[PDB]
């Protein structure tokens, strides 16, 4: 496990159980969180929850995160949030308060589930601090919008460090830095240079650089060619590339886990929406939130429980059409799914 955003262990002195903030969110949030707890109890894992509320409080018009949740999460060092609907930016303040600088986005095919692309196993780490997130827009002359975007060596030498340590930590040879024409944008020149500087501190790893143009041409014609690699990119192309990857693996954000790594805190979440018009009806698909659990486990050190709840479980239960869910042309229900998983747990 990566030295960069290392988990400071310490189970509960009394219970022998690790404390983990929740944030069940809304829409299909509740019923998906319920399924995670029933599979975490049923597999007997060293974890006691602590549901937080992150409803956007306003302080000086600047969106701030409630102190109840801040204290909870700063203490536990880990959180596992579900979806939440849309009112600054909820997700943007979340990353700013907890110092989350890296976003980890896996995209893997499900064995035994026929999707249009096959044998995809992609990992993409994107920067979260700067770029278009800390961007400024203004009107210069009457019909003219100017954008101002920032990139720094510090923030870059950090996702890139993490990318290296993460490739090592999952046993992958190459880290690929994706960028746009290096000579016509010295912003990508800075990102690439930083990556070459760190190349030497990681001799077990091969550093490749690729034009984002070529990357998308290759990955789409043959996704497997990147299952031995970990890609990093600047904040700019991160949104686009990660969503393209999930389109290769599944055809939607439905089955996609994500990790937001900070220097000490780390939040794990599915990236699909609240989907309110399917709430209560027990049709939700907890696979996404489940797989973020796995990533969370693995970040805590509970490797045995991680593989247990991932290896068999939902991965293998997503085989056989009477399971699945409405989204994956299945017939099962969020309840029937949870225990169908506890079956081969």
């Amino acid at each position: 496990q990566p030295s960069i955003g290392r988990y400071t262990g310490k189970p509960n002195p009394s219970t022998g159980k690790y404390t983990v903030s929740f944030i069940e969110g809304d829409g299909i949030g509740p019923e998906i969180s319920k399924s995670v707890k029933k599979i975490f109890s049923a597999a007997n894992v060293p974890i006691e929850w602590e549901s937080c509320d992150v409803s956007p409080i306003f302080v000086n018009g600047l969106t701030t995160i409630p102190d109840p949740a801040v204290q909870s999460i700063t203490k536990n060092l880990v959180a596992l949030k579900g979806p939440l609907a849309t009112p600054r930016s909820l997700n943007l303040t979340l990353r700013k308060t907890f110092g989350l600088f890296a976003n980890v986005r896996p995209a893997k095919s499900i064995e035994g589930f026929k999707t249009t692309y096959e044998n995809v196993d992609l990992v993409l780490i994107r920067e979260n601090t700067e770029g278009e997130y800390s961007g400024i827009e203004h009107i210069v002359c009457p019909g003219v919008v100017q954008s101002i975007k920032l990139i720094t060596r510090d923030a870059s030498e950090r996702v890139i460090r993490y990318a290296f340590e993460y490739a090592r930590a999952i046993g992958r040879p190459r880290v690929i830095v994706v960028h746009k024409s290096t000579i016509q944008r010295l912003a990508d020149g800075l990102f690439v240079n930083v990556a070459k500087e760190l190349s030497k501190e990681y001799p077990d790893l091969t550093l490749e650089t690729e034009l984002i143009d070529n990357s998308v041409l290759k990955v789409v014609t043959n996704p497997s060619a990147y299952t031995d690699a970990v890609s990093v990119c600047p904040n700019l192309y991160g949104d686009i590339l990660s969503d393209l990857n999930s389109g290769l693996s599944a055809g939607s954000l439905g089955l996609t886990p994500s990790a937001n790594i900070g220097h000490k805190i780390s939040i794990f979440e599915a990236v699909h929406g609240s989907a309110p018009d399917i709430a209560g009806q027990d049709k939700a698909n907890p696979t996404a939130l489940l797989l973020s659990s796995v990533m969370m486990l693995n970040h805590m050190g509970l490797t045995n429980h991680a593989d247990q709840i991932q290896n068999a479980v939902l991965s293998t239960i997503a085989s056989g059409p009477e399971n699945r869910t409405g989204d994956l042309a299945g017939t099962a229900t969020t309840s029937s799914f949870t225990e169908a998983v506890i079956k081969r747990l």
């Binding site: 954008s147 998308v216 041409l217 789409v220 969503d243």
Partner: protein, 334 residues
């Protein structure tokens, strides 16, 4: 007809550019088309005397056929020639056509999208500076007149080629002002000036996902400079690679035809000339020929449909010359 002869600018490019360019020159003399090449020797996509000569030739002839340099500059839209065409000639609209071909093994069949991208602003007109060490700042502009042009261009193009959907691709969720402007202008010009055409919007990240998973939902995509390259490369992958993608670049007074993917993905005489030839037929259409365009188009479609004489990137084993000669062969018997 009976006319006279068009002089068109020919800018062959590097070694591969010259191979595929010569494929077109060969097919054209074989079909005895009333076109005289005014061929311009541009050492590099940077060679200052060559870029000046190409611009000057385009000012005279108005129409151009242009090969590739496989330097990273030419493939991204930068480098001296591309900026000259954009700053001096005000060629503002890049069009790429992604049509699936009958005899090409693709994971998703029957694709037919058109990507239209703005070519004078955003990525192509910024300013970048490092004013304190270790900090790079970008200043880019999006303006209403440039986005109105590209809007009318896209809708005018949909109208002319009987396309029924135009989707604006943007990032207005984050860039609420600049990409908001873009989305709004495209949708307004749609409802007021082009009612027979369906307008829609899609955030660019979602469009990426949607393009690799369910390409069929899209028809004509219109995007700013920065997202065009990414959407275009998904397009190229979807139909079997850059060697199959026709392209054109338009300004008010000028048009330059060229492969629409800049051939992202060598050896001697092995490159696929299809993109160049198809772009060549876009040029024929534009010049008002196009009886010739229909024939040349049928020839290459037929040649690639039968797996014989196909070049190595679409599963054949023939040289670019073999492929050219096969096409010329079906032409004489036509």
């Amino acid at each position: 007809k009976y006319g006279g002869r068009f002089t068109v600018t020919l800018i062959p490019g590097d070694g591969v550019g010259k191979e595929i360019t010569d494929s077109v020159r060969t097919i054209f003399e074989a079909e005895n088309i009333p076109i005289d090449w005014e061929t311009i020797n541009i050492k590099q996509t940077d060679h200052k005397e060559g870029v000046y000569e190409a611009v000057e030739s385009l000012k005279r002839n108005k129409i151009g056929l242009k090969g590739l340099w496989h330097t990273p500059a030419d493939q991204t839209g930068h480098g001296s020639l591309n900026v000259a065409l954009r700053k001096q000639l005000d060629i503002y609209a890049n069009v790429a056509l992604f049509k699936s071909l009958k005899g090409v093994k693709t994971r998703i069949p029957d694709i037919d999208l058109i990507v239209i991208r703005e070519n004078t602003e955003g990525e192509f007109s910024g300013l970048e500076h490092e004013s304190v060490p270790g900090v790079v700042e970008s200043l880019k502009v999006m303006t209403r007149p440039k986005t109105e042009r590209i809007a009318r261009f896209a809708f005018d193009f949909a109208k002319k080629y009987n396309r029924k959907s135009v989707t604006a691709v943007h990032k207005a969720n984050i860039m609420k002002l600049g990409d908001g402007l873009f989305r709004n202008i495209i949708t307004e010009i749609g409802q007021k000036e082009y009612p027979d055409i369906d307008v829609s919007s899609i955030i660019v990240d979602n469009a990426s996902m949607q393009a690799v998973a369910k390409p069929h939902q899209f028809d004509v995509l219109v995007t700013p400079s920065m997202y065009g390259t990414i959407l275009g490369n998904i397009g190229a992958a979807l139909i079997g690679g850059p060697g199959l993608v026709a392209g054109a670049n338009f300004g008010r007074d000028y048009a330059v035809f060229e492969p629409g993917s800049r051939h992202v993905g060598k050896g001697q005489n092995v490159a696929n000339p299809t993109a160049m030839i198809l772009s060549s037929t876009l040029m024929l259409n534009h010049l008002g020929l196009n009886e010739y365009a229909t024939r040349i188009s049928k020839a290459v479609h037929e040649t690639i449909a039968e797996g014989k004489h196909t070049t190595r990137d679409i599963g054949g084993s023939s040289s670019t010359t073999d492929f050219t000669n096969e096409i010329i062969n079906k032409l004489s018997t036509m």
